Ligand binder design. Structure first.
Ligand code: MG
Ligand code: MG
Lengths: 422, 451, 448, 422
DNA sequence: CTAATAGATTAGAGCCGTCA
RNA sequence: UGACGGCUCUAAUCUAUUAGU
DNA sequence: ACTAATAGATTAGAGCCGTCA
RNA sequence: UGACGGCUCUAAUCUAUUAGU
């Protein structure tokens, strides 16, 4: 027999009110037939009149929006509806649901004013309840409510372009590995040599002061030009410790433990990197934390390095992509690399106030995304390299550390449908 | 090559014992859990505030549009989602008139300015509650120009009387006309308005005394806890210690989410740990709550924190463990640079992926790209959170799944997910309110008052 | 051979500005004044008490009948008269201790037993209010002697309404004696019990059943009554409480001035000057701030005469010209009147005037429409005298007649005495049966 | 066959009154058709309205208000009503009703008031009763009430039976007036006639002590037998005071005030009444206040006086009447009595316990009404008299007071109709 | 006992944008 | 104080070592 | 001097009963 | 404490005299 409560709606026209109404109607009992619900086939009004209107429909719920006059589909549906209304001679067959406001009786379709219907303009919960009681008073058949069916249907229909898939993908990290180290770390004794007032950071090579163990990665005679009175000392009293043993954590003596030694090495590599950035034709900017390194304008070929942008202009100022680094040692010897944006008033002189710096950083970085960040970081790291495969951090006369320019690569299993676009 | 482990997204409960993921769609489809039906409300403010509140209140009934319904869903109406009544014909209103003499700020010592400004509203509310015959559920105070600690003091001085209160500014409600007065536009909610209505309605309904939704993937006999220290240095003495906690328990039938609070103090400037004697009382009270509620001692207890535990203060915790309960402690950190970049495209890594460096430490991605919403939660490429099992023995992946599931309970908002677990968030939420004034003993441990 | 006088019966207001006489008929015909819809409830007691309360609450929803419905009208059902929901599915409940180890304290020190018993319920209610997540309106404490006073006294600070019921009252069908005799027989009253319980529950939930509709602007009514406190050794004898009836620009104001002003001496009841000054100042200030103007006229009701020097202190506070007419009400004067023929006594509303000041008023008689007599025996009148001030006696008679119908505690046709004195006598013991409290609440629902 | 009644009203403005009327009518029993309660959704309203006003209508009461004066629908509906009135040949079809009664008369409809109408300004239940009696007089076909009505029909009207009729009636009070008094009050003095220890209350005649004087009511030599050594004293020094001079309050003196004299007179009359009441062949019972006087068993014919029972036998005990008297003189010199019942076991010796006395009192007095109390009080006050006119009260040798045996009467002009007996 | 280098580990406190 | 997140900028303390005891 | 006492006329507490012919 | 009324029983002050240093 007929049990489906057909309700008409403007599927192509932008409408989002029929979906939840139909969902709660089917979850509240009787079945509902909709065009937007059964969106799995493409055909004109052929099966509708063939099956439901003629034989498989009890009531109709023709809605009445503002743009119903222009749409010919609703007019054809209303014509078929009045034909069947004449066929069964039942007046209560067409209830013109009204939602919008601009429908004026003076300017309205000449045929829709035949009847009056429940009003959904005020609040459609009251319309829901009055529709339910009107349906009850006319002995409309309805099955006992099984809302799990509605939940399952909602899960099924709204699934395209969602959820996860099994596609494979790869990611590149923000770290950079360390592939070499000097063979041994040295501690020298100078005592009577070194003046007890002058600063040690000014040396051409990184070296820091301990109680007696003057820490170095180079020989015991490499500071002669910087400073005199060093040839009256013997190298037999110096101390050397293997790098593999200290790195493995096995080395330990009474005076020094392992963690202090690892911290010493981290400080050494940090200072070495900071010193090495002196002769790479770049400038530096000072922050609350460690320095940032930015590139000058014009020094690079038409502001690009292998078809990529690093220095640009924003309305009046100029923006540069600067980086900062910090050595880490726990999981593997690597370098944290962080990206910042530096602003200048013409390209040679930096804007002074920090507040406008922050505002300009926000304004410029508003509309950047994953690809741009990754590309710029990779390009800057590659350009900073002095070799086609790695980077040499110069620690001594002939000793150096090697850092590769290929970040760690990860990959997983789960993924999604990438071209979401919007 | 090192892989990434994936964790399935949990699900939350709704009315009629149904399951969904996004709270907005579930609420719009199913409904809240318990049935309350009274939102008798009262306001306090000038005439303009009253008329603006009335206008917004009757506006909220109609359906509201959003520009991208795929990302931010619809709001059909208050009577539909909640099944309650909230009108403008059942309100009580008390004038503030144009006294306004405090506006000269006394030209100095703004502390007493804040004192007097908060005192006016506090005395009005107290007198109205004590003398008036009518019954009121929540109060919406409307304030028009520059102040610092109004919010903390207002809720601090009203804690004893235990009256819920919500604070609103008519600039937010009436952003349509509060546009550029000289060429400086301020707000524009055209792209968002439905979201604003959603959030305000959810907050008001929760304050009224209703439970919108609850989690449904908890394990029986398992407790939870939070911890955070607050800095109080307005007085000369170095105090540095304000330890609160929250509790999320599985009752015999439902759930329980409350706070265990009493300001525990500590000398010394930078000693962020806890004294051996004081920890005993905190653990004893936390244990006793479950013992009295569930007629038995808990089986497993998890402690969450943002700092590590020393040896002696943790050993003090062991003397209170009844028979064998394991007090596994977890430390969460939110600053470690491991930005992972997708190889190709323009969309970042999607949430749910975790990285394990060892049996203790882990990186968890609570923020990413949600395929269902077809949008990202973070503006730029997201950064993960570091999770470390400090003391005790447990399984790392299970802890990861539990903390991931704990991020979907934020009753102050209606967002798909939260960056950090709520158990940490609410302790910090109540810490400043408690430390605004130290003249309370045995404060309420509910949630309507502090939020 | 003198002449009696008749005073027309006043009327009470209802919904849509309707007026009637019988509160039950008016409520059943139109309904309450304001619209409220939430009766979320919480009950503390044993399991048997909870199940009895549930059974009675689900019973209430259906209409009930009385043997003589022409006298006492029937009850149609809660959903019809009030138009609000109050069901048994949204009730919160916390069990009391089952074994009740406090039972043997019944024969022990009475004060310690009472203190422990009240403390248990007080702590349970306080913890429930301060910790639980649900919201409740009123607490229906169920019990299975200076106990009702202390429970309400200690709850004054927290400002939470409550209402006390007994198991035997709700379950009189089965809670008979052990010798085959019904302790309570409610067959003839069964409908009226539901009526009064429903009215009290609705009022304490924040609603208003009815209000007066024949008041004059600019007139303030004030009452006073003294309570005796001698549990402590010091002779105090002075506990002055008061109410206030005001006509707001739209509605009415019904609250009570509070703060038990004291006075030394044993039997010196009248007053002290400074306390009188403070009382009058506070009363005047309340109306002045509420209505933005000083009251035109003030009437001072009392049940005992007062002296002149204290009355002079009262006069010293009169703002411009307000006349503080003081009225003395006494209840024990034998002037029984017998009907000449028949078997029905004299109806209410009659009055006897003997001079410019004294009068007898018959507020107790038989109602013609109800066809029944309020008093069981031949009624007796009440004596009214004007002590200090100048006014018109008949106006005072009709005003005090109109003031005897606003009793929210019950649903009777009329009350014997004005409710202004009754409510102060109701709150005096609650104020005086505990430790000193500063600035107590001014709402009646807390005390009642 | 036409049963339902069409109610015309201004729907956009007034709906509550129509709902009230419809609910009252359906609760009464008559079947009613209305607009918003039965049929408005999803049908052509004009066809249904016309067929209802043409086929199945009996009365056509309408709602009149200033808002509905210029509404096209109701006025055209009323035009159809006039057209069908000119076809049915029955003038009892339209009964207009008014809700608003604060408008000038020169704005009314062209003709709506030509028939009999009712007003609702005063109330709504009284107008409902007016419409009900109009319906009853016009013989509208009745409807089945399911044998449950006549309960609302008791209270359908605002006033059930209450109204103050103008009939005359009388009442008998509980006070008895003193119609005479002896001439002067006396103050004797010797300071040695009596010892300073013995009690004056044992004297055969009332008298009291005031200062060195003896205040009294009879001659000075009347106490010779009880107190010897008195006749030898002079009687000139005694003081006489007129009774009328003090009863009017005009008299005043430094050594005695008027209110003190009134108190003395009250004391004297109370004591004299006790003294006389001692010798009237009756017994006395002691209460917290002054005694009460009752009658022994078997001292009258068949335990009654003037065919009115005064002593009765209960299930086990015996009940007797009793009165207690006190004199007051503010509004007039009068004596007021109060009635009580005293219980004994046979009629000689009475019960002792107070609780059983109270219980028996309540049980016996449960079912006594005004007539019985009045008749018993009148009979008891009549029997106690020594004369057919009044009661004497001797104070001394020859002076005496008279008390009338007829209570003061009060007549009233406003009363009720009847208790209908039944 | 107080001051300078440096690492790793904590808390506050403002200001801009709304997921292409 | 309708919410959320991304930056930027200021402080403590704890742990080797040196010098001003 | 306040301790008793015998009156008139107020003013407050408690403890039991019936239910509106 | 469901709530109203009708009684029955206790005590205490405020006046005005006279009895005790
Ligand atoms: Mg909030
Ligand atoms: Mg009560």
């Amino acid at each position: 027999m007929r049990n489906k409560i057909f309700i008409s709606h403007a599927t192509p026209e932008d409408d989002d009110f029929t979906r939840w109404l139909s969902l709660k109607l089917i979850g509240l009992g009787y079945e509902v037939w909709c065009d937007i619900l059964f969106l799995d086939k493409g055909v004109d009004f052929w099966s509708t009149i063939e099956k439901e209107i003629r034989e498989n429909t009890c009531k109709f719920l023709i809605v009445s929006s503002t743009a119903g006059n222009k749409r010919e589909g609703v007019l054809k549906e209303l014509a078929v509806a009045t034909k069947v209304k004449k066929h069964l001679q039942d007046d209560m067959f067409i209830i013109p649901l009204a939602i919008d406001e601009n429908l004026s009786y003076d300017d309205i379709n000449i045929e829709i004013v035949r009847l009056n219907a429940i009003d959904f303009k005020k609040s459609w919960a009251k319309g829901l309840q009055d529709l339910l009681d009107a349906f009850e008073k006319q002995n409309v058949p309805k099955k006992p409510p099984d809302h799990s069916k509605s939940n399952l249907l909602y899960q099924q229909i709204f699934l395209h372009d969602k959820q996860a898939i099994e596609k494979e993908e790869t990611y590149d990290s923000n770290w950079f590995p360390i592939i070499s180290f000097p063979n041994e770390l040295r501690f020298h004794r100078y005592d009577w040599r070194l003046p007890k007032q002058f600063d040690v950071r000014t040396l051409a090579f990184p070296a820091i002061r301990y109680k007696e163990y003057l820490c170095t990665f180079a020989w015991e005679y490499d500071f002669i030009h910087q400073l005199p009175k060093t040839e009256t000392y013997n190298g037999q009293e110096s101390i050397r410790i293997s790098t593999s043993d200290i790195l493995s954590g096995r080395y330990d003596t009474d005076f020094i433990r392992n963690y202090e030694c690892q911290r010493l090495i981290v400080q050494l590599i940090n200072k070495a990197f900071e010193l090495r950035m002196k002769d790479k034709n770049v400038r530096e900017y000072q922050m609350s934390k460690t320095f940032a390194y930015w590139i000058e304008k014009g020094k690079l070929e038409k502001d690009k390095f292998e078809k990529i942008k690093l220095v640009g202009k924003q309305k009046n100022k100029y923006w540069h992509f600067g980086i900062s680094a910090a050595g880490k040692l726990y999981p593997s010897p690597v370098l944290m690399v962080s990206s910042h944006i530096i602003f200048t008033m013409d390209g040679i002189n930096l804007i002074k106030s920090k507040s406008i710096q922050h505002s300009s950083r926000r304004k410029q970085g508003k509309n950047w995304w994953n690809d741009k960040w990754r590309e710029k970081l990779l390009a800057f790291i590659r350009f900073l390299s002095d070799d086609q495969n790695a980077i040499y951090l110069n620690v001594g006369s002939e000793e150096k550390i090697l850092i590769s320019n290929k970040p760690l690569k990860f990959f997983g299993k789960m993924s999604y449908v990438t071209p979401s676009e919007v | 090559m090192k892989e990434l482990i994936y964790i399935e997204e949990p699900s939350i409960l709704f009315a009629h014992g149904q399951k969904c993921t996004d709270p907005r769609d579930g609420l719009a489809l199913f409904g809240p859990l318990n049935q309350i039906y009274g939102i008798k409300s009262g306001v306090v403010g000038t005439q303009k505030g009253l008329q603006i509140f009335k206008s917004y209140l009757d506006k909220i009934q109609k359906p509201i549009y959003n520009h991208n319904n795929i990302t931010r869903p619809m709001f059909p109406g208050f009577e539909a989602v909640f099944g309650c009544k909230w009108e403008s014909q059942n309100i009580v209103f008390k004038e503030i008139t144009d006294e306004e003499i405090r506006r000269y700020l006394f030209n100095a010592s703004t502390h007493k300015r804040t004192y007097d400004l908060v005192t006016l509203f506090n005395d009005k509310i107290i007198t109205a509650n004590k003398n008036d015959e009518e019954r009121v559920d929540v109060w919406f105070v409307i304030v028009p120009n520059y102040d610092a600690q109004f919010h903390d003091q207002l809720k601090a001085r009203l804690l004893e009387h235990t009256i819920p209160t919500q604070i609103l500014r008519e600039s937010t409600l009436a952003w349509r006309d509060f546009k550029n007065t000289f060429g400086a536009p301020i707000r524009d909610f055209s792209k968002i308005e439905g979201h604003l209505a959603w959030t305000i309605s959810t907050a008001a309904y929760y304050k009224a005394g209703g439970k919108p939704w609850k989690l449904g993937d908890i394990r029986p006999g398992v407790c939870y806890l939070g911890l955070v220290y607050k800095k109080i240095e307005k007085s000369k003495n170095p105090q540095n210690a304000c330890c609160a906690a929250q509790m999320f328990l599985d009752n015999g039938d439902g759930t329980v989410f409350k706070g265990e609070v009493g300001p525990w103090y500590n000398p010394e400037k930078g000693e962020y740990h806890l004294k051996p004697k004081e920890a005993k009382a905190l653990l004893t009270q936390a244990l006793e709550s479950y013992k009295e509620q569930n007629k038995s001692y808990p089986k497993e207890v998890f402690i969450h924190a943002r700092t590590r535990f020393n040896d002696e203060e943790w050993n003090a915790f062991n003397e209170v463990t009844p028979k064998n309960t394991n007090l596994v402690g977890v430390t969460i950190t939110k600053s470690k640079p491991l930005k992972l970049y997708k190889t190709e495209g323009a969309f970042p890594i999607m949430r749910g992926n975790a990285y394990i460096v060892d049996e203790k430490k882990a990186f968890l991605w609570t923020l990413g790209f949600v395929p269902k919403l077809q949008s990202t939660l973070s503006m730029e490429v997201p950064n993960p959170i570091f999770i470390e099992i400090n003391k005790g023995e447990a399984e790392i992946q299970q802890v990861l799944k539990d903390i991931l599931a704990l991020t979907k309970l934020n009753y102050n908002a209606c967002i798909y997910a939260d960056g950090e677990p709520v158990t940490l968030r609410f302790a910090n939420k109540i810490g400043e309110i408690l430390t605004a004034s130290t003249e309370i003993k045995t404060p309420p441990l509910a949630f309507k008052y502090y939020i």
